[PDB]
Amino acid sequence: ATLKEVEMRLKSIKNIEKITKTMKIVASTRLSKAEKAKISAKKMDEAEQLFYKNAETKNLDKELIVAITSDKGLCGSIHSQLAKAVRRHLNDQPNADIVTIGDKIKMQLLRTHPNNIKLSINGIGKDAPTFQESALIADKLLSVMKAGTYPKISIFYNDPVSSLSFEPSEKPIFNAKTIEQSPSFGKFEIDTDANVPRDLFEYTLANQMLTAMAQGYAAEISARRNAMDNASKNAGDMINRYSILYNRTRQAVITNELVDIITGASSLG
Amino acid sequence: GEWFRDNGKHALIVYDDLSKQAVAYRQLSLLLRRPPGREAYPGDVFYLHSRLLERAAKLSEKEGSGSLTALPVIETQGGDVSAYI
């Protein structure tokens, strides 16, 4: 409780609040950048999902679970919240194998279920995700996992409900087997001789992966910007406390040493 | 301890503590109207403990290879080491 300890500590926390402020501004810039990718992925995906509204591809009756975070953290109740949604859906089907995209959700899920994890994707959260990346990973799923064999496919992403709120969200994927079995499907004219469901299912997988990545990415940067704002606020409050502690400490030190100066001058001849 | 040490033997002394000794010596010096130094302690308290703890040592062979080993104890205040004592 010296002047030195409180001074060095207060200077450290001032540096911390400055860095959190700069991090919040960089998070705002990256969030404003990532909203463009989120909207351009969503408006592309809606052109295929309005079809699934019309072509009611609603399946019947082993399961694949894919979760979406980044490699980094520092975005608060996202990595644990989405892992808790994984917990909700995985207590239903514990046999459901898992392919994580994101190091942090992989560390969330590997501690609780190292069994179902069979593929892990890394090198993601540095940038806005591209369709090259998403289509490449969707190719890898029908290369090392063969998800068309899997009956039910769930995609776990993070939906930014606002800039100050969020949601871990589930998206079902219907295999191409379901696509010919769909009731509102012969309404749409389709060539039998062109493998249109067996390629449109891949196209669906690629688009939903890209939408999940470009949506959970923006959700991460939103909650991260929120967390850095809360950090700047808390750091400012703690600076406001320890500055007052510093002033009381400095005044007490000068007074207490002046006491000893006087007391030596007190017992003179 | 020096009695054992000069009889060639080996003795461990454990003071507990030097802090109450410092308080008592401060009390005697202030009651003897000696002008106190820093933190109202007497000036030669460093000399006081130096001539306390240098009496414990290992003797050479021609002295009989006696030894006095010392364990001083300090109670501190809130985990401080920067105090004068």
Question: Which domains, and CATH codes, for chain A?
Answer: 1-25+228-269 (1.10.287.80), 26-227 (3.40.1380.10)
Contacts of A24 (CB under 8 A, 6+ apart): A225, A228, A229, A232
Indicate the helix (H) or strand (E) that contains B76: none
Beta pairing partners, A227: none
Helix ranges restricted to H, A55-98 = 79-92
Q: Which residue has the tokens 């000696």?
A: B34
Burial class of residue A104, CB neighbours in 10 A (0-12, 13-18, 19+): buried
CB nearest to B33's CB, from A1, A264, A267: A267
CA pair distance B61, B82, nearest whole angstrom: 39
Q: Compute the distance between CA of residue A74 and CA of residue A69 in angstroms, rounded to an integer.
A: 12
Chain B residues inside the 8 Å CB shell of A3 = none
Q: How far is the alpha carbon of B67 from chain A, nearest alpha carbon, in Å?
A: 40
How long is chain B?
Answer: 85
3-state secondary structure of A65: strand
Resolution for the entry shown, Å: 3.6
Strand A152-159 with A63-68, pairing: parallel
What is the side-by-side strand order in the sheet with A167-174?
A117-121, A97-101, A63-68, A152-159, A167-174
Distances (CA, A) of A26 to A12, A21, A22, A128, A161: 21, 9, 6, 15, 21
Residue in A132, A59, A145, A35 with CA at minimum distance from that of residue A100: A145
Residues of A in contact with B40 (CB under 8 A): 260, 263
Here the contacts of B39-46 (C-beta below 8 Å, separation 24 or greater) are: B39/A260, B39/B83, B39/B84, B40/A260, B40/A263, B41/B84, B41/B85, B45/B85
Closest chain A residue to B82 measured between Cα atoms? A2
Collapsed DSSP state (helix, strand, coil) of residue A129: coil
| Chain A residues close to B35, C-beta within 8 Å | 264, 267
What single letter denotes the amino acid at residue A97? Answer: D
What phi and psi, each to the nearest 5 degrees, are found at residue A167?
-160, 125
CB within 8 Å: B38 and A260 = yes
| DSSP β-bridge partners for residue A119 | A99
- Rounded Cα gap, residues B20 and A142, in angstroms: 79
Measured in Å, how far apart are chain B's first and last C-alpha atoms?
24
Experimental method: cryo-EM
Task: For A131-156, give one letter per residue: b (16+ CB within 10 A) or e.
Answer: bebbbebbeebeeebebbebbbbbbb
Q: Which of left, alpha, beta for A152 (phi over 0: left; psi -120 to 50: alpha)?
A: beta
